[PDB]
Amino acid sequence: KLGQIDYALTAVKQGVTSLGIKATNGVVIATEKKSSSPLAMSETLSKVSLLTPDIGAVYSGMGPDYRVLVDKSRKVAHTSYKRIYGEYPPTKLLVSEVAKIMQEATQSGGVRPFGVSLLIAGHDEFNGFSLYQVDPSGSYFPWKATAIGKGSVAAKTFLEKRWNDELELEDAIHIALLTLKESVEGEFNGDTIELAIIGDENPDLLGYTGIPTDKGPRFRKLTSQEINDRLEAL
Amino acid sequence: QVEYALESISHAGTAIGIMASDGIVLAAERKVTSTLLEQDTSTEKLYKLNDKIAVAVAGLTADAEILINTARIHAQNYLKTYNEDIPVEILVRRLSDIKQGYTQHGGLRPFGVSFIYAGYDDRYGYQLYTSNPSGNYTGWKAISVGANTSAAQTLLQMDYKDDMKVDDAIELALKTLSKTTDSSALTYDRLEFATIRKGANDGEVYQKIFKPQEIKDILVKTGIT
Amino acid sequence: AALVRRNNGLSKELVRTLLFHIKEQIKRGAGSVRSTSEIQQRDVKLVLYLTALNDVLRQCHESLLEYSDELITFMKYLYDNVTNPPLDVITSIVIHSALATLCTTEITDCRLFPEDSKIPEKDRWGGLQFDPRRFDKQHLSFQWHVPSSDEITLSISILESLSEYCINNVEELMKAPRHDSEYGDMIQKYVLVMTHTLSGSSLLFDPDFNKYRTRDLDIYTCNYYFGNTTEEKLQNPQYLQVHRVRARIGHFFHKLYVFLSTNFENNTNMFQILLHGLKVWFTDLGQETVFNEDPNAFIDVDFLENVQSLSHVNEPFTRTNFAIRANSLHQSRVLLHSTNRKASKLENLLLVDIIQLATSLYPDIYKPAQGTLVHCMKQLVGSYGVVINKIIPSLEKAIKDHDYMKIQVILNVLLIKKIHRKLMTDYKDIGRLIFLLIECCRVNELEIGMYADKILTDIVIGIKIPSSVCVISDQAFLPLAPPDGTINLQVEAVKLAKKKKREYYLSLLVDLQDKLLDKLDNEKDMGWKIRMFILRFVTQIQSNLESKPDKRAVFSIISQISTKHPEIIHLVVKSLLSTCNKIISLSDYEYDITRAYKNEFNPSFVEILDTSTTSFPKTFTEEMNNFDNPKYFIDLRAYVGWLCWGRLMYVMSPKALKLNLRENELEVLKTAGHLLTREFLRDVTMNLVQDNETRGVFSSGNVSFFSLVILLISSGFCELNMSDLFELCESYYNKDDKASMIMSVEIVAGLVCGSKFMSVSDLDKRDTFIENFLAKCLDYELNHDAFEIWSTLAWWLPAVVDLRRSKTFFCHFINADGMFDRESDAATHQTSKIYMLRSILMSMEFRAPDVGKLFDELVFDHPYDQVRQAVAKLLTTLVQNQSN
Amino acid sequence: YDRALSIFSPDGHIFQVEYALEAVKRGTCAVGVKGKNCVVLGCERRSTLKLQDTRITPSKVSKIDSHVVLSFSGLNADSRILIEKARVEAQSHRLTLEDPVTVEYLTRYVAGVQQRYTQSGGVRPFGVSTLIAGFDPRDDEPKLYQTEPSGIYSSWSAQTIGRNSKTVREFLEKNYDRKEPPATVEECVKLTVRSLLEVVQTGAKNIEITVVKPDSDIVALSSEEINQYVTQIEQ
Amino acid sequence: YARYELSSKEDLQLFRLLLKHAHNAKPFFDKSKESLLVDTMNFLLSSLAPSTMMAVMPIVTSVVPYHYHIHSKIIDYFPFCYSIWSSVSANVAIDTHMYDFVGSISKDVHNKILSSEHEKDVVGVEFGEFGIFTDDQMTFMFNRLQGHLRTDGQIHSYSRTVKPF
Amino acid sequence: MFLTRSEYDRGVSTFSPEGRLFQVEYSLEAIKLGSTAIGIATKEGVVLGVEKRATSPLLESDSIEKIVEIDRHIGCAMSGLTADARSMIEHARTAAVTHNLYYDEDINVESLTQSVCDLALRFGESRPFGVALLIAGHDADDGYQLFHAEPSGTFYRYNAKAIGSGSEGAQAELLNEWHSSLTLKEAELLVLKILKQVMEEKLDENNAQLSCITKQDGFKIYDNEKTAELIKELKEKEAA
């Protein structure tokens, strides 16, 4: 029965683990950053990405496919909503456009599916905080918590034990770091982990002040020092 | 040359439509799903088209939501054009023709979905219909699509009476589902429920797509716990 | 490794050059960078020299004795210095290869010509393959390898040094300090080393060690270095020492289990390594069943036999192939040695730890732990009882606690083929398993209830039955009777004990049926989970073999008609017909259960015709034309006499079928008949009509149910008349409802089939009814729907019943007015009449003589093509009928 | 048995529509006969499931305009698209040329869409046939036509598209004669009646018949008139 | 009361297993019981119709032993087998039993002639130009075989099909 | 019966080792399988005849037409009426009307024959396309002309040509019978004589259709009554 998309799913099931967890007051997206060589400067490639100041993504599977996907996803979030509506999309709108991009590749002959599954997390005024999984098929599903890649069956069993409707963002970060700790291929520290939140707004990260209307990014990538501070208790 | 798309819907949970002498009654059942898959969403079974028309779906939400949005757009356009809301027959024919095209044109795929369109308009009164991947549609006194279709249609046939009230159609839909349930009890979280009735007392069409507590209340009327 | 198998003198330099290069690569930093998933590019040379070391060491034998101490101190250095999880597996195979080569018996020499020796001439381009001197003892004298005593004193020194070593490393490091991600790898390493020492040293262990606590006969006797008799091996202290180390390793896996259970729950990799260690500890006794079938440094017996085998030539083989065939015989004798044993308190303790890991809720722990459990159950006698005695209480606690996920894991355990097969024989515990699966059907959460219903369906469909009937020739056992017509009072005692336990096992199935029926009677709100309930009474109460009929089963089954569900009704009408067929077959077997399986018993209504008389060849033609006073009947298909007469032919007598039955059986048929009211039939048949709306099928199960109603009426058990079944049949005949006129035609079919029970006055009533009813339905107008229902009857009825059991049925189709009229218009009505007659004549092969009037009636001259083609198809079947 | 020298594919080609033309036999009987001064179409009704609503069911026989009627055997879903295309084309002609559509132009256009769904290859042909009948404007010659899935079309004095429509055609050839056809609507109706009562997949729900008369006089006979017409002789 | 039906998978499997067991035990049916061959063939011949063909053919091919008395010989039933075989179009269900029957009788007469026991058994059974076949039987089988290989494909076991050639 | 296949069979756009395109050869022999059409050219007119399929008495008329008008000056005959024949005819019709309004003059019959061949080389827009055509017409330059236009997108002019059922013996009798001196009546009798021989000796106005091109009337298909008196004129003239 198998075709080219079941093989793109096997590329995803072979890829490095990533996860998402939704809390009462925000969302976590998190992954291991694996180095090809100890001479490689691991800050120079980003596993977790800003799509809009209130939407972020993490992948599993083929890293180069995800990099071209996120460049297109950013261009999609601009030419579509910033340049005609004047404002950024809800997470649902951008997940549909990402799935439209992924479906176009599986459809065209002489192209292959994107070898990545995506976790897209974000905020919206009407829908609030949300987490979605986008697969090589160009299909999308909403999740309370999820994991993708090698560790996903054990990770999803731990996420099923630990998720509840009352978790705070700070405790969802502890669950996320516990879930990444068990699947870790390399070392476990603030330089091998990559972690972001969409949570409260951060007016410092607006990078300007005055105009009362703008509130700055809901999205925030944690620095390695903030991760290491949490890892001292973890 | 479409019968595999009709096979597709047979798995997809179950929807019951029952027409009374004074209303219509849509009920449908959500399939049991993963603990962490989000339920509080737009992809459900009992949707709407306008204040006089509701649908229940079998088959994939990704094929449903395009047709539901096309129907909402076409119904808004009709109300905008004529200042009287679209007849149920014209909605189902308009949706039956879009679906036929994607089945006969080999550059496209048949929509793997089958919606039960309940409604009211004064040209024919309350109207219960079913449409399926082939692009054919039929009018009914009662109907069901998806899982347990055959078992449900027998229980519909042996209990349905043409003179019945909307309240009898509430009972018959709930009792049919509790006879033909895959889970050995029925609960408000698996059940989606709606009615179309003649106003509070005056002439208007009154929809309700029931909230979880109102579903619990009709389950404890009807003796399902 | 193959070089070192041929020459032991190469191993000393190659083994010291390899361990030097491993030290060089380890000091240069190989295995200093962690990754779980991959061998890194900097590790490749370390992996080469380690895999070369593993492969060379497996073939060193008695040459390890030269550098044994140097290897042991190198093994310690390697277990200190490298801790990358992909390398712990490669580095722990070093002891397996070392210990394995010291205790293994196997072929060294596979040469085409031995030892640079012998003299078969220089013209040997062929390897003696066809030369008749291939079988010679001086050609096939293989050196082989037989473990020395020095190699055995070294194998025990390596085994207890390394095992005790890793025992003092993991205990000095068992304080659960934290989840470092490097703590877990050091535990995994020293545990892997403990698993590579049990394998390899496994040829020293003994499945029997526990029996020989503190003249038994083996056929597959492999080469053991302790003894073949129990006194030969107990008198060696080296024997106790080997078993003592395996006890000490086994107690360590229980201690490690409680440590990882108390401190490191959810660490999947650490429980997986433990489960593989426990598999090796349970399975590798006197033999090795891992690294047993991967590619190694011996020539493959199946491969060389594919190169050398000739179909009609005796062993056209060279010396290499004879050598590896003698090696394969030895390996077969090793593996065919039994490991089944009576568990030792430590095996029970470790089994109960494996059962809890099979009950774990991480897929990555439970899937390996269930695979280890099925291996353990092959190794230990009585182990299914222990497993189900732990699993049943855990499902009960899981339902009591609302422990979803754990309920579903226990149901996926109950679907394991070994446990699942044993459940079907498990009369004493299938009772408590069934009631616990019924409570599991209420649970809504996951796919719980769907797995429970699947398991309950398998218990019913797959139920084992006690058989008190055994039809044997005495020559199945008299050829082997030993001379002692005295001590063989033992077969009598076994027959008695088999009888007593077969009676007791059927009592458990009867008691379980009674206790289920009580729950169906009492739970008015049980729901739609009573489908497997009446389906279980079906297989029990239809069973024939010592299952006594129960009037409460019939009553409680019949009363399920009060639920309107079609599938309960099909199973209710289906079940009520299988139970009466059990009573009916009891009566004609005259309460003799063995006649169901005897060739020489024909029921009193079957009679055997000479069919070899001077008049019988022609007596058959005049009898097959007798509708007025038939001498006998042949339902089904006739066959005797088509090619020639001669043999004994079986026929049904003309007489009405009289039941003779004892008290208990009359009461259940009177209970059925008392509840077969007019309204019960009206309910059942209307429900069958509304179920048949979309499908539109004709069903022989319904016909067989009307045939049973006719038996109950003619016996006086049912208070209906025949005329009620004639008012029901007339009532369902609408030209517009296909499903309704299917039910009507099924009552016609039933009335003709029921003719074997009907009396001469009921026959007359039926035939005047059928005469009027066929005429009313078929003479005037016939739509395409009614044609297909009657055409189905016309094909099916002459196949299942002799039409001469009626005076009017077949008579209606042959005499039908205007079949062949040339000027009728009305073409489809003529077509239908002809095709219905044709279908009866096709179904009545070489039967119904003197239809020869038809040849004068046939019209070749009809204006309408449809009738013209129907005449042509009829002439074909008429020509065929006489052509035999 | 055109294997010859075990030859296969010596022409290298194929053309095929006939899967659609088989569905056009499976479907309900539809029969039409001219009179001297009328045309009658009669079509089989499918038996209806227990819980259907009959109030809105289409007549099967289908008006395109006050002088022209269409009926069909074949797929109902496909037939709607042809009826809708024929209705928008009839309105488009009637608007743009200030005179009603001529019966042959309507058939040429219905044949035009069945031709395009044959030719275009990226679509199947429609699984249906048409029975197009009526009268031209300012005319009293009755006119009667067929189209087939192939996009072929033809004119008939009587015709029948169905599964048992080979015996209707034999009864029509036995009783119709183009030298002297059934003149009055009485005979014309009674002959489509005799046709339909022979070989239709009949029941208590049976047949829908429509008389067309000249100058836009289009009339479905009542469920009583189709019964009054049952005049018989039997022996 | 009919306990077994062919065209049900469990009973067809019991039949094939009892036919294999019949074929394996066939050498030990007693040559001193002189009527056994003709008593059995009288019964199996008289049992033959289209409705019993697919049972009776395998039973003839499997149970009936190769006995060669002065009065009764198994080669007397060749004309009967060639009657069924030559009357039908090529068909796996029939043809496979026909080749199987004449093939094992050919190997048996051949083996008996070479063995030091023909002096009792196959004495007065002649091995001819074509073995135990007549020219018209061999002509029929060679024409049957070329139809299988060039026209209809109706072979199941190729070992048993080349057996009589 | 033996098998004579090759490794270059069913090769599309591919030369065999001989330089053969077998697809266009296969398409070019399927012209033997259709209904018989015959063309006779004379100094007096071009005659086209075709065998008609027998029809039910109830059939009043039909749009199956194996002889078709392209223009007043040009007519055409098929052995089959697939979609590709329709495509070639409606291309030839559109080609005729566009030339008429460009030069104020009638299209030459060669130039129209060339145009339907170019359509088959284009495949509409080494494949074969459609069906064999006989193309008949008159123009002031090259007089009365008859062409065989082939599925290969190539053609020949013939003095007489048969296509469809009967090929070897159909063209054998035409080359035996054709004269430069034929009158039109004599050519009509000759196409009816040939049609009778190929039809396994049957001939009615219900199975033979005739047409001719002349300057004066252009392309016309004969009435059933006109072909009926011509069939009687054949029946007496052979019996004389």
Q: Which CATH number do you get for residue A121?
A: 3.60.20.10
The resolution, in Å, is: 2.8
Instruction: Give the C-alpha separation, C542 to D169, whole Å.
Output: 57
Contact C646 E43 (CB under 8 A): yes
Strands (E), F52-142: 59-62, 67-71, 74-78, 133-139
Helix, strand, or coil (residue F91): helix
Nearest CA among D88, D21, D38 for reference residue D219: D38
Q: What is the distance in angstroms between the Cα of E21 and the nearest Cα belonging to chain C?
A: 15
Query: Is F4 part of any domain?
Result: no
Chain D partners within 8 Å of C734 (Cβ): 204
A109: exposed, middle or buried (C-beta count within 10 Å: 0-12, 13-18, 19+)? exposed
Query: Is F1 part of any domain?
Result: no
Find where tokens 């300057």 sit: F215
Is chain C adjacent to chain A, meaning 3+ CB pairs within 8 angstroms?
yes
**Inter-CA distances, C710 with C446, C655, C748, C760, D142, Å:** 48, 16, 12, 14, 62
Instruction: Give the C-alpha separation, D44 to D48, whole Å.
Output: 12
Torsions phi, psi for D144 (to 5 deg): -150, 125
Mark residue C633 as left, alpha or beta (left: phi above 0; alpha: psi -120 to 50; beta: remaining): beta
Q: What is the distance in angstroms between the Cα of A226 and the nearest Cα belonging to chain C?
A: 19
Chain C partners within 8 Å of D50 (Cβ): 690, 693
CATH number for the segment(s) B1-225: 3.60.20.10
Give Cβ neighbours of residue C835 (< 8 Å, ≥ 6 apart): C791, C794, C870, C873
C639: exposed, middle or buried (C-beta count within 10 Å: 0-12, 13-18, 19+)? buried
Q: What is the distance in angstroms between the Cα of B173 and the nearest Cα belonging to chain D?
A: 15
Instruction: Give the C-alpha separation, A169 to A164, whole Å.
Output: 12
Q: What does the DSSP 8-state code read for residue E114?
A: H
Strand order in the sheet with F143-149: F67-71, F74-78, F133-139, F143-149, F155-158
Bridge partners, F77 (sequence order):
F67, F134
Residue environment code for C416-453, b if the CB has 16+ CB neighbours within 10 A, otherwise e: beebeebbeebbebbbbbbebbbebbbbbebebbebbb
Torsions phi, psi for A133 (to 5 deg): -100, 130
CB C585 within 8 A of CB C603: no
Nearest CA among F116, F125, F132 for reference residue F34: F132
Neighbours of C606 (CB within 10 A): 14
Q: What is the distance in angstroms between the Cα of D127 and the nearest Cα belonging to chain C?
A: 23
Contact D53 B134 (CB under 8 A): no
CB C278 within 8 A of CB C253: yes
CB A131 within 8 A of CB A143: yes
Tokens of C560: 């399920």
Find where tokens 């309950």 sit: C456
Instruction: Give the C-alpha separation, C750 to C744, whole Å.
Output: 10
Four-point Cα dihedral B69, B71, B72, B78, nearest 10: 150
Q: What is the distance in angstroms between the Cα of A229 and the nearest Cα belonging to chain C?
A: 16
For chain D, the domain total comes to 1
Nearest CA among C559, C591, C762 for reference residue C671: C559
Instruction: Give the C-alpha separation, D147 to D145, whole Å.
Output: 7
Query: In one letter, which amino acid is F6?
Result: S
Q: What does the DSSP 8-state code read for residue D183?
A: -
Give Cβ neighbours of residue A131 (< 8 Å, ≥ 6 apart): A20, A21, A22, A27, A29, A119, A120, A121, A142, A143, A144, A145, A146, B38
Instruction: Give the C-alpha separation, A135 to A59, whole Å.
Output: 10
Helices (H) and strands (E) in chain F, counts: 6, 11
CB A13 within 8 A of CB A152: yes
The answer, for B157 touching chain C at a CB cutoff of 8 Å, is yes
Sign of torsion, CA F49 F50 F54 F55? negative
With both helix axes pointing from N to C terminus, report the angle between C827-843 and C865-882 in degrees, rounded to the nearest 10: 20
Q: What is the distance in angstroms between the Cα of F63 and the nearest Cα belonging to chain D?
A: 6
> What's the start-to-end Cα distance of chain E, in Å?
44
Query: In one letter, which amino acid is D130?
Result: T
The answer, for B35 touching chain A at a CB cutoff of 8 Å, is yes
Chain E partners within 8 Å of C585 (Cβ): 1
Contact C647 E2 (CB under 8 A): no
Instruction: Give the C-alpha separation, F151 to C652, whole Å.
Output: 73
Helix, strand, or coil (residue E132): strand
Paired sense of beta strands D217-220 and F37-42, if any: unpaired
Helix, strand, or coil (residue D220): strand
Mark residue B13 as left, alpha or beta (left: phi above 0; alpha: psi -120 to 50; beta: remaining): left
Tokens of C512: 């379980």
Is chain B adjacent to chain E, meaning 3+ CB pairs within 8 angstroms?
no
Which runs of consecutive H residues, i.e. helices, occur in C119-218? 149-172, 183-198
**Closest partner CB to D156 (pick from F29, F33, F58):** F58
Neighbours of C627 (CB within 10 A): 15
Element (H, E) at D100: none
Bridge partners, C633 (sequence order):
C652
Domain boundaries, position F107: 9-240
For chain A, the domain total comes to 1
In angstroms, how far is CA F151 from the centroid of its own chain? 13
Contact D166 C865 (CB under 8 A): yes
Helices (H) and strands (E) in chain A, counts: 6, 10
Q: What is the distance in angstroms between the Cα of B224 and the nearest Cα belonging to chain C?
A: 10
Contact A144 B38 (CB under 8 A): yes
Instruction: Give the C-alpha separation, B142 to B26, whole Å.
Output: 10
Contact C863 D47 (CB under 8 A): no
Is chain C adjacent to chain E, meaning 3+ CB pairs within 8 angstroms?
yes
Cβ–Cβ pairs < 8 A, chains B and D: 54
**Partners of chain F (3+ Cβ pairs below 8 A):** D
With both helix axes pointing from N to C terminus, report the angle between C490-522 and C551-558 in degrees, rounded to the nearest 10: 30
Chain B partners within 8 Å of D117 (Cβ): 104
In chain C, the largest separation of any two C-alpha atoms, in whole Å, equals 114
Element (H, E) at A57: strand A55-61
Torsions phi, psi for D40 (to 5 deg): -110, 130
Helix, strand, or coil (residue A224): helix
> What's the start-to-end Cα distance of chain A, in Å?
44
Contact A159 B62 (CB under 8 A): no
Tokens of C649: 């032919």
Secondary structure string (H, E, C) spanning C47-70: HHHHHHHHHHHHCCHHHHHHCHHH
Give Cβ neighbours of residue F186 (< 8 Å, ≥ 6 apart): none
Torsions phi, psi for D33 (to 5 deg): -135, 135
CB B75 within 8 A of CB B50: yes
Nearest CA among B208, B218, B159, B202 for reference residue B48: B208
Query: In one letter, which amino acid is C845?
Result: E
Q: Which CATH number do you get for residue F221?
A: 3.60.20.10
What is the domain partition of chain B in residue ranges? 1-225
Tell me the residue length of chain A: 234
- In angstroms and rounded to an integer, the radius of gyration of the C-alpha atoms of chain A is 17
Instruction: Give the C-alpha separation, A43 to B132, whole Å.
Output: 54
Nearest CA among C57, C47, C48, C50 for reference residue C5: C57
Which runs of consecutive H residues, i.e. helices, occur in chain B? 3-9, 61-82, 88-104, 149-159, 166-179, 212-221
Residues of C in CB contact (< 8 Å) with B are 441-442, 444-447, 449-450, 527-529, 564-567, 686-687, 690-691, 693-695
Contact B124 D56 (CB under 8 A): yes
Helix, strand, or coil (residue B199): coil
Tokens of B99: 């679906």
B105: exposed, middle or buried (C-beta count within 10 Å: 0-12, 13-18, 19+)? middle
Instruction: Give the C-alpha separation, F39 to F187, whole Å.
Output: 9
Find where tokens 């073939």 sit: C59
CB C242 within 8 A of CB C279: no
CB C823 within 8 A of CB C644: no
The answer, for C784 touching chain D at a CB cutoff of 8 Å, is yes
Structural determination approach = cryo-EM
In angstroms, how far is CA C777 from the centroid of its own chain? 50
Residues of D in CB contact (< 8 Å) with B are 50-57, 76-78, 80-81, 84, 117, 122-124, 126
Instruction: Give the C-alpha separation, E57 to D47, whole Å.
Output: 49
Tokens of C563: 């639920």
Vertex F77: Cα angle to F72 and F78 (nearest 5) = 145
The answer, for C640 touching chain E at a CB cutoff of 8 Å, is yes
Q: After which residues is chain C broken (C to N over 2.5 A)?
A: 214
CB A7 within 8 A of CB A24: no
The answer, for A46 touching chain B at a CB cutoff of 8 Å, is no
Helices (H) and strands (E) in chain E, counts: 7, 0
Instruction: Give the C-alpha separation, D155 to D138, whole Å.
Output: 20
Sign of torsion, CA C494 C496 C499 C500? negative
Strands (E), chain F: 37-42, 45-51, 59-62, 67-71, 74-78, 133-139, 143-149, 155-158, 160-163, 208-214, 218-221
Taking CA–CA distances from D167, the nearest residue in chain C reads C864
Neighbouring C-alpha atoms within 13 Å toward the C-beta of D156: 27
Instruction: Give the C-alpha separation, C621 to C882, whole Å.
Output: 11
The answer, for C821 touching chain D at a CB cutoff of 8 Å, is no
Helix, strand, or coil (residue D56): coil
Tell me the residue length of chain D: 235
Query: In one letter, which amino acid is C261?
Result: S
Instruction: Give the C-alpha separation, B177 to B15, whole Å.
Output: 9
Query: In one letter, which amino acid is F228?
Result: A
Instruction: Give the C-alpha separation, C866 to C827, whole Å.
Output: 7
**Inter-CA distances, C338 with C206, C326, C345, Å:** 10, 21, 20
Strands (E), C594-636: 606-609
Instruction: Give the C-alpha separation, F182 to C241, whole Å.
Output: 122
Contact B184 C442 (CB under 8 A): yes
Strand order in the sheet with F218-221: F160-163, F37-42, F45-51, F208-214, F218-221
Instruction: Give the C-alpha separation, C443 to C404, whole Å.
Output: 9
Chain E partners within 8 Å of C643 (Cβ): 45-46, 48-49
Element (H, E) at B198: strand B191-198
Bridge partners, B142 (sequence order):
B18
Query: In one letter, which amino acid is D32?
Result: G
CB C460 within 8 A of CB C499: no
Nearest CA among F177, F178, F174, F176 for reference residue F163: F174
Vertex C421: Cα angle to C415 and C426 (nearest 5) = 105
Instruction: Give the C-alpha separation, D145 to D148, whole Å.
Output: 10
**Inter-CA distances, D68 with C253, D91, D103, Å:** 91, 12, 7
Vertex B106: Cα angle to B104 and B107 (nearest 5) = 125
Neighbours of F68 (CB within 10 A): 23
Q: Which CATH number do you get for residue D208?
A: 3.60.20.10
Query: Is F110 part of any domain?
Result: yes
CB E99 within 8 A of CB E162: no
Instruction: Give the C-alpha separation, B97 to D83, whole Å.
Output: 12
Give Cβ neighbours of residue C507 (< 8 Å, ≥ 6 apart): none
Nearest CA among F157, F221, F227 for reference residue F188: F227
Tokens of C328: 């394969």
Instruction: Give the C-alpha separation, A45 to A32, whole Å.
Output: 12
CB D208 within 8 A of CB D59: yes
Chain B partners within 8 Å of A139 (Cβ): 62
CB C713 within 8 A of CB C722: yes
Domain boundaries, position D86: 1-235
Helix, strand, or coil (residue C846): coil
Contact C527 B158 (CB under 8 A): no
Nearest CA among C611, C610, C656, C604 for reference residue C630: C656
**Closest partner CB to E43 (pick from C585, C596, C647):** C647
Q: What does the DSSP 8-state code read for residue F154?
A: -
Bridge partners, C879 (sequence order):
none
